[PDB]
Amino acid sequence: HHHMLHLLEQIRAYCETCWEWQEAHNPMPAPVEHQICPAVCVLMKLSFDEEHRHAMNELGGLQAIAELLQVDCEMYGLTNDHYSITLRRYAGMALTNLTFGDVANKATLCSMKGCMRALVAQLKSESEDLQQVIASVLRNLSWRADVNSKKTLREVGSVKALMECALEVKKESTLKSVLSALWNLSAHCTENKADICAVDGALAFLVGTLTYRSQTNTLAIIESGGGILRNVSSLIATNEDHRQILRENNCLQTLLQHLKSHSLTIVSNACGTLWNLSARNPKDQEALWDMGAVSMLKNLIHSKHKMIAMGSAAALRNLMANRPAKYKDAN
């Protein structure tokens, strides 16, 4: 543990020298001249081990690594070199590991508003790998976030930045982290839901994730994409333009097909989405009737899973109370 203690001292000393340069306004400190990259690389690697993490927390490892990432972003911005990119990647990975399951660490990092702004800015880095790392941090922070953390996550603009980021990522690994963070954020409040729906192209993109073809034989993208959609579907139900985006990217039929998934996550998401979209709109009701939605939702009403049971029943009630004019034996 005194290797760890030594590396953290290196990082704190470097930060202090950066803070002195900032407050002066001594040349501008350069992380390369203080061998910062190796120091954070090693800490990042130790952060994967549970015992080493606990040692690291006694030394305020989270605080110090966050302070380093923050000060480097402030000093050099996104007009930074590969040394800086690398440093931020390794710092970001450590922050991901240190925030995982850790109530105190999540609260500390979300209280660091400057650091939070720095993190969000990194979603436009030239390194898509760095975007994935930062989205992994934001995912942990948005999971079981307290009231102050929810407030800071929203006020630093993480939702719009993550949704915009999602539209530009190429790799499935980046998309998974980005969509997972958005799924967590989309449950926090109604403003987060509105901010997602307001990004041009987001609703169509999200519908596209419902039929994602994973190379890695997993459902992660479909689950998160569908979870985001279920969370924002309350507002989509109020906006005819947004409903139309869903219709013309084949959202309704795909949601009915999700009701057969082995993933209870996929089934629950789809039931929740169908619950909200089956309300009021007679043309969406008729479309669902015509696709056999009634018997499909009826098959799920005795689920042990509380949300599948309630959602499937609620959707069914909406349809049964609004049998289309054409069905009435006819006419």
């Binding site: 994967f48 990975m93 991901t96 925030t99 992994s136 999971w143 998160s224």
Partner: peptide
């Protein structure tokens, strides 16, 4: 979506 370690 939950939380996870870096991967």
């Amino acid at each position: 979506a939950g939380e996870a370690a870096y991967e």
